[PDB]
Design a protein around this ligand. Structure first.
Ligand SMILES: *[C@@H]1O[C@H](CO)[C@@H](O[C@@H]2O[C@H](CO)[C@@H](O)[C@H](O)[C@H]2NC(C)=O)[C@H](O[C@@H]2O[C@@H](C)[C@@H](O)[C@@H](O)[C@@H]2O)[C@H]1NC(C)=O
Ligand SMILES: *[C@@H]1O[C@H](CO)[C@@H](O[C@@H]2O[C@H](CO)[C@@H](O)[C@H](O)[C@H]2NC(C)=O)[C@H](O[C@@H]2O[C@@H](C)[C@@H](O)[C@@H](O)[C@@H]2O)[C@H]1NC(C)=O
Ligand SMILES: *[C@@H]1O[C@H](CO)[C@@H](O[C@@H]2O[C@H](CO)[C@@H](O)[C@H](O)[C@H]2NC(C)=O)[C@H](O)[C@H]1NC(C)=O
Ligand SMILES: *[C@@H]1O[C@H](CO)[C@@H](O[C@@H]2O[C@H](CO)[C@@H](O)[C@H](O)[C@H]2NC(C)=O)[C@H](O)[C@H]1NC(C)=O
Ligand SMILES: *[C@@H]1O[C@H](CO)[C@@H](O[C@@H]2O[C@H](CO)[C@@H](O)[C@H](O)[C@H]2NC(C)=O)[C@H](O)[C@H]1NC(C)=O
Ligand SMILES: *[C@@H]1O[C@H](CO)[C@@H](O[C@@H]2O[C@H](CO)[C@@H](O)[C@H](O)[C@H]2NC(C)=O)[C@H](O)[C@H]1NC(C)=O
Ligand SMILES: *[C@@H]1O[C@H](CO)[C@@H](O[C@@H]2O[C@H](CO)[C@@H](O)[C@H](O)[C@H]2NC(C)=O)[C@H](O)[C@H]1NC(C)=O
Ligand SMILES: CC(=O)N[C@@H]1[C@@H](O)[C@H](O)[C@@H](CO)O[C@H]1O
Ligand SMILES: *[C@@H]1O[C@H](CO)[C@@H](O)[C@H](O)[C@H]1NC(C)=O
Ligand SMILES: *[C@@H]1O[C@H](CO)[C@@H](O)[C@H](O)[C@H]1NC(C)=O
Ligand SMILES: *[C@@H]1O[C@H](CO)[C@@H](O)[C@H](O)[C@H]1NC(C)=O
Ligand SMILES: *[C@@H]1O[C@H](CO)[C@@H](O)[C@H](O)[C@H]1NC(C)=O
Ligand SMILES: [Fe+3]
Ligand SMILES: [Fe+3]
Ligand SMILES: [Mn+2]
Ligand SMILES: [Mn+2]
Ligand SMILES: [Mn+2]
Lengths: 571, 228, 342, 114
């Protein structure tokens, strides 16, 4: 008696190599309710059977085939509840396979399927899409990672690249993927599963520092035809130690959201699009980005990994987009993660360590070092043990020790969970201003090797400490730091997009600035003696906190407490 | 110390320390073993003091001496004292992180501190997380150490921070002291008494047998062979 | 003349990947002539079966006791010629054994005269392996879903040694989601063997073989450890500390809780007798010449086949069917640290 | 005090020094010039003696007065070092004879050669 329908137009998307397209849906129900909704399904052949929730990460709607995204029937057609007629405009990204649209009654908790649409598809569902750059194993190597629907028996993947308007060459790609049974638990292994296609990585070697390059993604089909992406471009990184103005953006916890306003699983990153927007707007003056964990919050609704790669593509296809792993990438009980949280929704790190490349020796461990001119970054993995005696602690010490501070003065430590200092309500309620055991072993290393700034995500706000060691400020300036500061500055920058976290009602001795809002940091190294940190809000891109460090090499070499090398009395 | 640098304390009083300047020692009383730390010297892993503490905790035969008590002046465990919380801590900086390895491995039953001038009791706890949810009548393997601030002996009272943590079961902003009574090898009583009237205002009991001490807990599970 | 090869997969690549492993093949004159150290009557058969099946073999590991020249140096050329139809087209990865290296007073851990004065020199020159130090002859190598860690049993392997440190680094550096199949290779038996000569000295291994290393095999979940040296074939249950950790004989599923140990020293040299003991952990024995083929079908399915050199046919086998989460699950003495915090 | 005297090109690439690189088949060429990276792109052109030549990039480093920790380096003895460039000549054939030249491509499009 609903005699319902739903129909999509157009049914062929992405002509002229486009990989995003607007679709218009129109639908009807003879017995409308305010809780009627539309789901987007890809593949188009979905199961509308109920698969009841089995843990806190399996969420409504409880369908055996998780939709890509969904929206209430009355979203833009505000008379729907009276007329039973509506329409939606949705912006679809190409992520292989095809699409169906379905109309449901009963809300997200008790849905009943009443109509299914015609199928729609991109012209080439398998097209190479969403490249992301990452620094490689050496300063003069950059990696291009992308997704296609072509396996190695379907096509030979490659990148064609060279200096802008110069000679181009082809270089191979390694091809990796993962399957449902690679996922450790639900929803990733069950209702949230979606075939990720094939992830290809090319290594663009022997780069000239500072030079402009172009690249294209290719797949040589075994029938002899080659399928090509559009042209992309990038500027090669500096030689390590090079004097030039160098700009780095850092934040955690950005996640994803639908530009078309649609709902989706784990749709709790309301600042996500604003942060993405501000970085895109300022991209001419951003050289490299670090997203320090809590990447997309797919949490086992696997389809969102493609969404995320598409969201960041205007950034990551032109500047390196360096990731760290956080709890929503990795944590799962009984999987060797240090934290036994269900926060990865069964992913147990697999999508994060496959969708993105970092120059880690062991991509499962996800700790690594990388350079950008005057900066050295050491990236930790807070979902594995970091304490003294661990493999990770040994790595961190080696990373901090290997940097020549005359050439690379700016030494930055990055981690997802807060290993330093945070006034987050959730920490303070467990009697801590850090993860338990966060700082006690590692501060030995931060102090011995004079880490300048340590930055964290995970707490969804911004906070900055004084230069500090052992809970005590080592310098009393609020903004204009000069010389040997005698401690590391710690910064929480987990305000990238995910729902804001409240501060505890304590103002510590060491907490200089707090913002309960969405935002991110930009570091600018002007020269070997002068560094600027700026905190910008995502709502307007404007600066709300900042400091400078002005100091010379001799200041780095000078003794500080617990940072004073051995001497001989001899001459 | 106003210039004393330990000299009167280490001369006016005797304790069975190997080195009276270091002022850490072990002592027994029937079913109790006490390990006394010196919080004015370094206690962290790698230190002479940490080596002593491990040796003390390891040497006790828990069948014969079930009640294993750790004592220290500054708070190495957990405290909601305003002065700690203002520096972003619920302990001395670096207080618990190395030592909790030892408290947990050797199943210290109760760890007690002075220095903060009040009384506070935690749940059985490890790594900031309660390991047992009972407030008073503890039975069997508790899976963590109970920490108690008992620095309310006389010196001017210290205010608590305006935070009620997950682990803080009882607080008293007043003067008082603890009495431990071991009734037998399976039953221990803690009482907190106020100094104003000598009456009991907080208490708990532990009822457990030797096999409960021997049972594995998190970070307290000896090696095994598969062989027979 | 022109030669050819197919380049290896990208590490972690999903494709069907085939590996042959054996020890102790040696050499022999196909013209029936006699020569020094002519005690490898299975050599030509093993070589023949590999050449016959070469289309479906991607890489070979010959785990020590290569030619048994034993100082009659002319035979190194002989051996390179014998294996050329294999080694000129697929990688032919070597390990060093006692007949390559041992000589008293030369810093070899075993003081046997078994190298006939070579003291490793021909082996470490005639063949290349990607060892940091080719004299030490331990190294790591990959083939798609497989990681191999190759030990040198003629140098000390115990905890505290340079070699042990290397082994731990090799086992720790592999991403087991991408490369599930972790294989440990060594010449002398460091694991388990019912060889008569071991049992006579009161052992089912080299003395000190397994005790330190089993900590690493278990911590890092080595799937299969394979040895030469004993001239026969023997397969154990998944095992740790002399005790079977899984009761299956063929269809291994999930977390096995121990490493499978395989002796595959039947490549050609004169067969070795088993002791008259059938231990709790010894699933299969073959007193004959033969070799193993591993086939990785996908990231969750591995096949081991033992084939005789006489006919190339399969006489023992097993499968492992398990997912990434089974590698990550705790086993005894394989359980990472945790925090109680969230 | 006398009249001033100058080289025709004070900024010319000078005084290369070779050093073995990070692998047996890599050698480094380090030289000094007066051209910073915004003035010219530095490189080395090299190859087998009388064979084919290719260009390879250089990393460019320098230091300034306040990099010096004390006197006289930081004071009376200070003299601007110009720019120090290093190229990495890779995939060498052992024992083979090679030639090299130092280069700076000015952003006006002219190349200055050693
Ligand atoms: C190799 O396979 C390709 C994938 O099927 C072919 O492209 C496909 O060609 C169809 C028309 O022949 C067209 O309907 C498909 O949409 C198209 N798919 C894609 C991704 O391009 C390809 O055929 C060549 O390209 C097409 C578009 C035409 O120009 C043909 O004339 C070409 O043959 C196949 N190439 C060859 C050499 O067979
Ligand atoms: C140890 O393992 C084997 C178990 O199959 C035994 O060998 C096999 O024994 C069968 C029945 O006893 C017999 O049909 C097989 O031909 C024989 N040999 C094989 C499979 O190669 C073995 O038994 C000993 O070995 C021979 C000499 C037997 O005939 C018995 O007399 C021996 O007990 C087992 N050995 C022991 C000590 O149990
Ligand atoms: C449009 O649909 C939404 C979603 O079903 C309706 O929102 C619900 O409104 C009811 C009544 O006000 C509340 O009890 C629910 O909590 C709302 N649910 C959600 C998910 O927001 C909304 O009323 C509808 N509006 C119109 C004009 O039809
Ligand atoms: C995303 O940024 C937009 C644009 O700045 C925010 O929308 C504005 O919010 C401010 C309050 O700071 C209002 O005064 C303006 O009226 C809003 N809109 C515009 C178009 O200027 C939005 O709040 C940000 N989203 C989140 C979740 O922080
Ligand atoms: C020392 O103890 C005495 C005796 O209990 C306390 O004096 C009493 O304080 C109570 C309040 O709890 C009054 O109601 C009584 O009137 C007081 N006196 C007597 C003699 O009973 C005294 O407060 C304690 N001193 C301190 C500093 O706590
Ligand atoms: C090498 O392989 C050959 C070929 O299979 C083996 O020769 C056969 O062995 C069996 C038993 O002696 C006989 O049934 C056949 O008649 C043999 N000869 C053939 C088929 O030519 C040979 O024994 C193997 N050599 C060794 C040392 O194992
Ligand atoms: C690029 O700039 C260089 C340097 O100024 C030019 O070369 C100089 O040319 C002038 C004549 O205009 C001579 O007096 C100088 O001695 C030259 N200097 C050097 C170092 O060669 C060069 O001609 C310019 N090229 C272009 C295309 O304008
Ligand atoms: C056989 C299997 O799949 N799993 C067992 C598991 O039940 C056991 O708990 C673990 C050791 O703790 O060893 C293994
Ligand atoms: C913390 O400081 C800020 C700025 O002075 C203030 O708005 C807030 O009330 C303070 N909180 C407390 C508990 O003092
Ligand atoms: C920093 O540290 C040392 C103590 O080692 C102190 O003496 C020195 O004056 C301090 N320098 C600055 C710039 O604070
Ligand atoms: C802590 O708890 C006690 C007892 O419930 C109460 O009196 C006090 O107000 C609490 N403080 C806060 C900040 O909640
Ligand atoms: C305490 O710890 C273990 C975990 O090792 C748990 O399985 C056991 O049931 C617990 N026992 C009690 C009495 O809480
Ligand atoms: Fe987050
Ligand atoms: Fe042999
Ligand atoms: Mn997080
Ligand atoms: Mn005190
Ligand atoms: Mn041997």
């Amino acid at each position: 008696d609903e005699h319902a329908y739903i129909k999509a137009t157009p049914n062929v998307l992405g002509f002229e190599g486009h990989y995003t397209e607007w679709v218009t849906l129109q639908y009807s129900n003879n017995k409308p309710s305010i809780d009627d909704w539309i789901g987007v399904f890809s593949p188009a052949n979905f199961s509308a059977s109920t698969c009841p929730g089995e843990n806190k990460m399996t969420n409504p709607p409880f369908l055996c085939s998780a939709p890509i995204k969904f929206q209430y029937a009355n979203f833009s057609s505000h008379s729907y509840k009276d007329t039973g007629k509506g329409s939606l405009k949705l912006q679809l990204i190409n992520q292989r396979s095809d699409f169906s649209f379905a109309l449901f009654t009963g809300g997200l908790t008790n849905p009943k399927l009443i109509a299914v649409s015609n199928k729609v598809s991109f012209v080439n569902p398998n097209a190479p899409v969403y490249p992301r750059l990452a620094q490689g194993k050496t300063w003069d190597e950059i990696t291009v990672t992308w997704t296609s629907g072509y396996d190695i028996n379907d096509a030979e993947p490659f990148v064609e690249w060279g200096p802008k308007e110069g000679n181009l060459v082809k270089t191979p790609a390694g091809t990796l993927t993962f399957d449902r049974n690679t996922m450790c638990g639900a929803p990733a292994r069950t209702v949230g599963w979606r075939d990720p296609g094939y992830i290809h990585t090319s290594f663009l070697k022997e780069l000239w520092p500072n030079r402009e390059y172009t690249y294209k993604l290719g797949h040589r089909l075994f029938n002899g035809t080659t399928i090509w992406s559009k042209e992309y471009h990038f500027k090669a990184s500096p030689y390590p130690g090079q004097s030039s103005v160098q700009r780095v953006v850092i934040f955690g916890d950005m996640g994803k959201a639908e530009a078309d306003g649609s709902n989706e699983y784990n749709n709790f990153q309301p600042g996500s699009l604003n942060t993405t927007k501000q970085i895109i707007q300022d991209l001419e003056d951003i050289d490299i980005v670090f997203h320090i964990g809590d990447l997309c919050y797919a949490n086992g609704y696997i389809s969102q990994w493609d969404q995320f790669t598409a969201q960041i593509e205007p950034i990551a296809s032109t500047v390196p987009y360096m990731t760290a792993s956080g709890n929503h990438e990795r944590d799962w009980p009984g999987t060797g993660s240090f934290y036994g949280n269900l926060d990865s929704g069964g992913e147990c790190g697999v999508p994060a360590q496959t969708m993105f490349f970092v120059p880690a020796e062991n991509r499962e461990k996800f700790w690594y070092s990388t350079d950008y001119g005057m900066f050295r970054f050491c990236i930790a993995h807070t979902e594995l043990d970091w304490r003294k005696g661990t493999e990770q602690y040994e790595f961190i010490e080696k990373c901090l020790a290997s940097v020549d501070r005359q050439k690379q003065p700016w030494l930055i430590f990055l981690a997802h969970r807060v290993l330093g200092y945070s006034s987050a309500g959730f920490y303070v309620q467990e009697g801590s201003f850090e993860e338990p055991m966060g700082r006690e072993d590692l501060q030995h290393l931060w102090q011995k090797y004079k880490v300048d700034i340590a930055m964290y995500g995970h707490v969804h706000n911004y906070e900055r400490t004084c230069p500090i060691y052992q809970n005590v400020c080592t310098n009393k300036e609020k903004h204009n730091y000069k010389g040997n500061l005698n401690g590391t500055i710690h910064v929480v920058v987990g305000g990238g997009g995910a729902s804001l976290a409240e501060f505890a009602p304590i103002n510590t001795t060491w907490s200089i600035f707090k913002d309960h809002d969405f935002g991110f940091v930009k570091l600018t190294a002007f020269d070997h003696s002068n560094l600027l940190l700026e905190y910008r809000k995502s709502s307007d891109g404007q600066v709300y906190d900042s400091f400078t460090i002005s100091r010379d090499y001799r200041d780095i070499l000078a003794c500080s407490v617990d940072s004073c090398p051995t001497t001989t009395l001899a001459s």
